[PDB]
Scaffold this motif. Structure first.
Motif, PDB file in Angstrom:
ATOM      1  N   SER A  65     -29.083  74.263 -17.618  1.00  0.00           N
ATOM      2  CA  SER A  65     -29.331  72.883 -18.015  1.00  0.00           C
ATOM      3  C   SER A  65     -28.303  72.387 -19.024  1.00  0.00           C
ATOM      4  CB  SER A  65     -30.744  72.744 -18.581  1.00  0.00           C
ATOM      5  OG  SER A  65     -31.714  73.001 -17.582  1.00  0.00           O
ATOM      6  N   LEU A  66     -27.791  73.272 -19.883  1.00  0.00           N
ATOM      7  CA  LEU A  66     -26.739  72.874 -20.812  1.00  0.00           C
ATOM      8  C   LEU A  66     -25.489  72.452 -20.053  1.00  0.00           C
ATOM      9  CD1 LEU A  66     -26.305  73.101 -24.123  1.00  0.00           C
ATOM     10  CD2 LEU A  66     -24.744  74.925 -23.412  1.00  0.00           C
ATOM     11  N   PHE A  67     -25.072  73.273 -19.086  1.00  0.00           N
ATOM     12  CA  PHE A  67     -23.908  72.937 -18.274  1.00  0.00           C
ATOM     13  C   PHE A  67     -24.138  71.648 -17.500  1.00  0.00           C
ATOM     14  CE2 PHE A  67     -21.305  77.050 -17.804  1.00  0.00           C
ATOM     15  CZ  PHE A  67     -21.689  77.495 -19.053  1.00  0.00           C
ATOM     16  N   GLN A  68     -25.348  71.467 -16.969  1.00  0.00           N
ATOM     17  CA  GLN A  68     -25.634  70.261 -16.201  1.00  0.00           C
ATOM     18  C   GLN A  68     -25.558  69.014 -17.078  1.00  0.00           C
ATOM     19  OE1 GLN A  68     -26.048  69.697 -12.804  1.00  0.00           O
ATOM     20  NE2 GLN A  68     -25.730  67.679 -13.727  1.00  0.00           N
ATOM     21  N   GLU A  69     -26.165  69.066 -18.269  1.00  0.00           N
ATOM     22  CA  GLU A  69     -26.116  67.921 -19.174  1.00  0.00           C
ATOM     23  C   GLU A  69     -24.691  67.637 -19.614  1.00  0.00           C
ATOM     24  OE1 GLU A  69     -28.471  68.356 -22.656  1.00  0.00           O
ATOM     25  OE2 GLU A  69     -28.183  66.280 -23.305  1.00  0.00           O
ATOM     26  N   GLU A  70     -23.906  68.693 -19.836  1.00  0.00           N
ATOM     27  CA  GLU A  70     -22.488  68.516 -20.109  1.00  0.00           C
ATOM     28  C   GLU A  70     -21.814  67.751 -18.981  1.00  0.00           C
ATOM     29  OE1 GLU A  70     -20.489  70.576 -17.997  1.00  0.00           O
ATOM     30  OE2 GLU A  70     -18.685  69.454 -18.551  1.00  0.00           O
ATOM     31  N   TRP A  71     -22.125  68.106 -17.731  1.00  0.00           N
ATOM     32  CA  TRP A  71     -21.496  67.421 -16.607  1.00  0.00           C
ATOM     33  C   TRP A  71     -21.891  65.950 -16.557  1.00  0.00           C
ATOM     34  CZ3 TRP A  71     -23.103  64.674 -12.374  1.00  0.00           C
ATOM     35  CH2 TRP A  71     -22.120  64.393 -11.419  1.00  0.00           C
ATOM     36  N   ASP A  72     -23.169  65.644 -16.787  1.00  0.00           N
ATOM     37  CA  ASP A  72     -23.573  64.236 -16.810  1.00  0.00           C
ATOM     38  C   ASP A  72     -22.859  63.461 -17.916  1.00  0.00           C
ATOM     39  OD1 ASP A  72     -25.970  65.957 -15.719  1.00  0.00           O
ATOM     40  OD2 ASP A  72     -26.390  63.968 -14.944  1.00  0.00           O
ATOM     41  N   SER A  73     -22.772  64.037 -19.116  1.00  0.00           N
ATOM     42  CA  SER A  73     -22.083  63.357 -20.210  1.00  0.00           C
ATOM     43  C   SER A  73     -20.602  63.148 -19.897  1.00  0.00           C
ATOM     44  CB  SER A  73     -22.246  64.150 -21.505  1.00  0.00           C
ATOM     45  OG  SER A  73     -21.822  65.494 -21.334  1.00  0.00           O
ATOM     46  N   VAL A  74     -19.937  64.170 -19.350  1.00  0.00           N
ATOM     47  CA  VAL A  74     -18.513  64.042 -19.059  1.00  0.00           C
ATOM     48  C   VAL A  74     -18.296  63.017 -17.954  1.00  0.00           C
ATOM     49  CG1 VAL A  74     -18.319  65.930 -17.369  1.00  0.00           C
ATOM     50  CG2 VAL A  74     -16.368  65.348 -18.827  1.00  0.00           C
ATOM     51  N   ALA A  75     -19.215  62.936 -16.987  1.00  0.00           N
ATOM     52  CA  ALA A  75     -19.097  61.927 -15.937  1.00  0.00           C
ATOM     53  C   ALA A  75     -19.268  60.526 -16.513  1.00  0.00           C
ATOM     54  CB  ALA A  75     -20.118  62.187 -14.833  1.00  0.00           C
ATOM     55  N   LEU A  76     -20.194  60.360 -17.462  1.00  0.00           N
ATOM     56  CA  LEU A  76     -20.322  59.070 -18.133  1.00  0.00           C
ATOM     57  C   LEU A  76     -19.033  58.715 -18.865  1.00  0.00           C
ATOM     58  CD1 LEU A  76     -23.340  57.733 -20.146  1.00  0.00           C
ATOM     59  CD2 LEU A  76     -21.079  57.674 -21.161  1.00  0.00           C
ATOM     60  N   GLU A  77     -18.404  59.703 -19.510  1.00  0.00           N
ATOM     61  CA  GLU A  77     -17.116  59.460 -20.161  1.00  0.00           C
ATOM     62  C   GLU A  77     -16.065  59.024 -19.147  1.00  0.00           C
ATOM     63  OE1 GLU A  77     -15.443  62.900 -21.964  1.00  0.00           O
ATOM     64  OE2 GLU A  77     -13.613  61.892 -22.622  1.00  0.00           O
ATOM     65  N   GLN A  78     -16.042  59.677 -17.981  1.00  0.00           N
ATOM     66  CA  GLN A  78     -15.088  59.294 -16.946  1.00  0.00           C
ATOM     67  C   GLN A  78     -15.324  57.856 -16.513  1.00  0.00           C
ATOM     68  OE1 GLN A  78     -13.052  61.365 -17.341  1.00  0.00           O
ATOM     69  NE2 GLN A  78     -14.192  63.250 -17.730  1.00  0.00           N
ATOM     70  N   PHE A  79     -16.588  57.476 -16.317  1.00  0.00           N
ATOM     71  CA  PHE A  79     -16.908  56.094 -15.974  1.00  0.00           C
ATOM     72  C   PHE A  79     -16.405  55.132 -17.036  1.00  0.00           C
ATOM     73  CE2 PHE A  79     -19.751  52.403 -16.068  1.00  0.00           C
ATOM     74  CZ  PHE A  79     -19.547  51.928 -14.786  1.00  0.00           C
ATOM     75  N   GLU A  80     -16.699  55.432 -18.302  1.00  0.00           N
ATOM     76  CA  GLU A  80     -16.279  54.557 -19.388  1.00  0.00           C
ATOM     77  C   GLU A  80     -14.772  54.366 -19.352  1.00  0.00           C
ATOM     78  OE1 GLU A  80     -17.570  52.652 -21.556  1.00  0.00           O
ATOM     79  OE2 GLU A  80     -15.845  52.287 -22.856  1.00  0.00           O
ATOM     80  N   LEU A  81     -14.030  55.464 -19.246  1.00  0.00           N
ATOM     81  CA  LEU A  81     -12.594  55.330 -19.380  1.00  0.00           C
ATOM     82  C   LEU A  81     -11.945  54.824 -18.105  1.00  0.00           C
ATOM     83  CD1 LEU A  81     -10.205  57.848 -21.045  1.00  0.00           C
ATOM     84  CD2 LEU A  81      -9.563  56.870 -18.878  1.00  0.00           C
ATOM     85  N   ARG A  82     -12.560  55.026 -16.939  1.00  0.00           N
ATOM     86  CA  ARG A  82     -12.055  54.388 -15.730  1.00  0.00           C
ATOM     87  C   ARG A  82     -12.288  52.883 -15.720  1.00  0.00           C
ATOM     88  NH1 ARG A  82     -11.218  55.013 -10.798  1.00  0.00           N
ATOM     89  NH2 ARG A  82     -10.925  52.776 -11.177  1.00  0.00           N
ATOM     90  N   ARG A  83     -13.428  52.410 -16.228  1.00  0.00           N
ATOM     91  CA  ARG A  83     -13.579  50.965 -16.383  1.00  0.00           C
ATOM     92  C   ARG A  83     -12.561  50.410 -17.377  1.00  0.00           C
ATOM     93  NH1 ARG A  83     -19.440  49.689 -19.215  1.00  0.00           N
ATOM     94  NH2 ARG A  83     -19.018  47.696 -18.177  1.00  0.00           N
ATOM     95  N   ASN A  84     -12.398  51.076 -18.526  1.00  0.00           N
ATOM     96  CA  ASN A  84     -11.373  50.639 -19.466  1.00  0.00           C
ATOM     97  C   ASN A  84      -9.991  50.687 -18.830  1.00  0.00           C
ATOM     98  OD1 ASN A  84     -13.690  50.839 -20.991  1.00  0.00           O
ATOM     99  ND2 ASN A  84     -12.997  52.634 -22.151  1.00  0.00           N
ATOM    100  N   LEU A  85      -9.755  51.678 -17.972  1.00  0.00           N
ATOM    101  CA  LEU A  85      -8.457  51.857 -17.341  1.00  0.00           C
ATOM    102  C   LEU A  85      -8.174  50.746 -16.340  1.00  0.00           C
ATOM    103  CD1 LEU A  85      -5.978  53.612 -17.081  1.00  0.00           C
ATOM    104  CD2 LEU A  85      -7.168  54.974 -15.371  1.00  0.00           C
ATOM    105  N   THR A  86      -9.149  50.417 -15.492  1.00  0.00           N
ATOM    106  CA  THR A  86      -8.927  49.334 -14.540  1.00  0.00           C
ATOM    107  C   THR A  86      -8.750  48.005 -15.266  1.00  0.00           C
ATOM    108  OG1 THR A  86      -9.792  48.210 -12.573  1.00  0.00           O
ATOM    109  CG2 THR A  86     -11.399  49.007 -14.155  1.00  0.00           C
ATOM    110  N   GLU A  87      -9.497  47.786 -16.354  1.00  0.00           N
ATOM    111  CA  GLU A  87      -9.296  46.562 -17.124  1.00  0.00           C
ATOM    112  C   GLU A  87      -7.904  46.521 -17.743  1.00  0.00           C
ATOM    113  OE1 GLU A  87     -12.539  45.609 -19.787  1.00  0.00           O
ATOM    114  OE2 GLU A  87     -13.984  46.625 -18.485  1.00  0.00           O
ATOM    115  N   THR A  88      -7.442  47.645 -18.301  1.00  0.00           N
ATOM    116  CA  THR A  88      -6.136  47.648 -18.951  1.00  0.00           C
ATOM    117  C   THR A  88      -5.009  47.532 -17.932  1.00  0.00           C
ATOM    118  OG1 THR A  88      -4.837  48.715 -20.703  1.00  0.00           O
ATOM    119  CG2 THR A  88      -5.713  50.143 -19.017  1.00  0.00           C
TER     120      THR A  88
END
Lengths: 131, 188, 62, 49, 132, 49
Positions: free
Chosen positions: F25-48
């Protein structure tokens, strides 16, 4: 709160209307999918036999200290080790039970043979007394 | 009419065939194995040389196809009345609480004996050998491991053939679509 | 771990289940048992995989 | 959110996927790959800014 | 991928808001036009309750074959439940075998004590024969 | 009602802390958090971009 299958605390205990026992819903449904029969009464069992039930959840350990965790391999090794040792004890139990059964068989057979021995010895002794 | 009685007289014979019944092989699970003769000499310390004839009697049944050692068949046979009468004498004297006590003693003692040791050392608790016990047993485990590996490898080439038939196609299609299509759309 | 792997520094985990240690101490027995159990699980998974075949593969392509 | 019904997308396992190294090595390699992507997207964000 | 109204696959899929179902645009707008009801669950439905598909998105899609950490963890969990089921069954078999071990054990103990008593009686019989 | 409880043929093992579910579950929660980070920075990336 004592599982009869493994002993671990069941996170979703359920009750049965015919014979309530401590299981969890998911493995019951999986077994019914494999074999839709009641294991205890040898009778047809359905998915609707179990009513929903609510549970208060449990706490989690959360292994800390974050050191490039390679433990997963060793822990998996230990789980497999436990199951292998358990297979070992199973083979030992079967070997010893069959040996015990054969020992019982010819124990009782020799018992009967020496019953015949005793009967003939007493017969002869009493006939000698009779003479 | 004749057969109407004859097949019953035949049916008598199969019903007569139940007049000789034994065990272990009655349910035929495992068996005292094949190397019988050496153990009887090894038998230490009245009932130990006793089981040797029934184990010799076990060679009469088709378990001998596994392997044959020594033979020396010494079948004494039985009778149904003998079997029936001993079941009374055995069970007439042998009260439910001791069974609960018996279950406790064996289960613990079994956990005491079955410690977390890959080779069985309960007997070895009295002998003096531990390194050689690991040598033979788990070179034998490895040889069986190699045989199983070879048999599975014989099954790998069909897997590899079907998977060079499928996975290369899937990967080529997936990469070729996803990369060009997606990174092109973002520019459009 | 990012400060680590910025220079690659590929993570290392034990791969010593193919050496298949010769007759020795408890490590050899433990290794033999783990190889046997992994092999059994592997055989089970393959027999399962060809219980159905590549039908799931066809659905994935579609 | 509403639970909808889908046949679900099957995942045909690769030739080498039976737990054991066939899983731990691939898990490690995929970890390294997602890490590399994380860098290739961070540094790219910074350069685009 | 199948439509209940016609039995054919929907060329242009649409998901109903009131009840999760995959429709095709023409027939679903047809059933909305004829009445504000659900053809499946007989509940009020409208044009806005029909959800078109916005699949494109903007992120990188991912392969549901190998490169998915959720897939890797799900495979680990399937192995986990497989070995758990194996342990379950073998533990059940082990306790049954322990029952038959204990039964045979006390039966043989009784048999051994009876054998000792019998052999005592046969010794008495031999003594009786030798007294003559 | 619920009948008499049945602890039998269990040999209970106490719920020890160190266990696998936790790591999974620790690894899984890590994956969800890192995927949220990817979403955040891909939205910022497409905007930039």
């Amino acid at each position: 709160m004592f599982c009869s299958i493994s002993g671990e605390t069941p996170k979703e205990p359920v009750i049965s209307r015919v014979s309530g026992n401590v299981y969890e819903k998911r493995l019951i449904e999986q077994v019914i999918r494999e074999t839709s029969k009641d294991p205890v009464t040898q009778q047809e069992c359905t998915l609707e036999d179990l009513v929903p039930v609510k549970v208060p959840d449990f706490v989690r350990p959360r292994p800390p200290s974050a050191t490039s965790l390679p433990a997963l391999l060793s822990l998996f090794q230990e789980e497999w080790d436990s199951v292998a040792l358990e297979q070992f004890e199973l083979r030992r139990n079967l070997t010893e039970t069959k040996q015990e059964l054969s020992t019982a068989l010819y124990s009782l057979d020799a018992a009967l043979r020496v019953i015949s021995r005793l009967t003939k010895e007493r017969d002869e002794a009493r006939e000698a007394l009779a003479k | 009419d004749r057969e109407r009685r004859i097949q019953e007289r035949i049916a008598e014979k199969e019903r007569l065939a139940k007049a000789r019944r034994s065990q272990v092989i009655q349910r035929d699970l495992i068996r005292p194995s094949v190397t019988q003769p050496e153990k009887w000499k090894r038998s230490l310390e009245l009932l130990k040389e006793m089981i040797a004839l029934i184990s010799s009697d076990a060679i009469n049944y088709p378990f001998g196809n596994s392997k044959v050692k020594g033979t020396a068949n010494k079948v004494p046979d039985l009778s149904n009345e003998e079997i029936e009468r001993c079941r009374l004498l055995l069970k007439k004297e042998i009260d439910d609480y001791i069974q609960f006590e018996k279950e406790f003693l064996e289960t613990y003692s079994a956990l005491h004996n079955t410690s977390s040791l890959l080779p069985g050392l309960v007997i070895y608790e009295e002998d003096d050998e531990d390194v050689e016990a690991a040598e033979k047993f788990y070179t034998n485990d490895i040889q069986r491991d190699l045989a199983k590996k070879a048999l599975e490898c014989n099954k790998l080439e069909n897997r590899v053939y079907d998977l060079v038939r499928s996975s290369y196609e899937q990967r080529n299609f997936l990469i070729k679509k996803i990369s060009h299509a997606w990174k092109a759309l973002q520019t459009e | 771990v990012a400060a680590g792997k910025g220079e690659k520094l590929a993570a290392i985990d034990v791969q010593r289940y193919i050496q298949l240690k010769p007759p020795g101490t408890r490590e050899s027995l433990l290794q033999s048992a783990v190889v046997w159990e992994y092999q059994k699980s592997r055989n089970d998974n393959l027999y399962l995989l060809e219980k159905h075949g590549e039908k799931a593969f066809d659905s994935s392509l579609e």
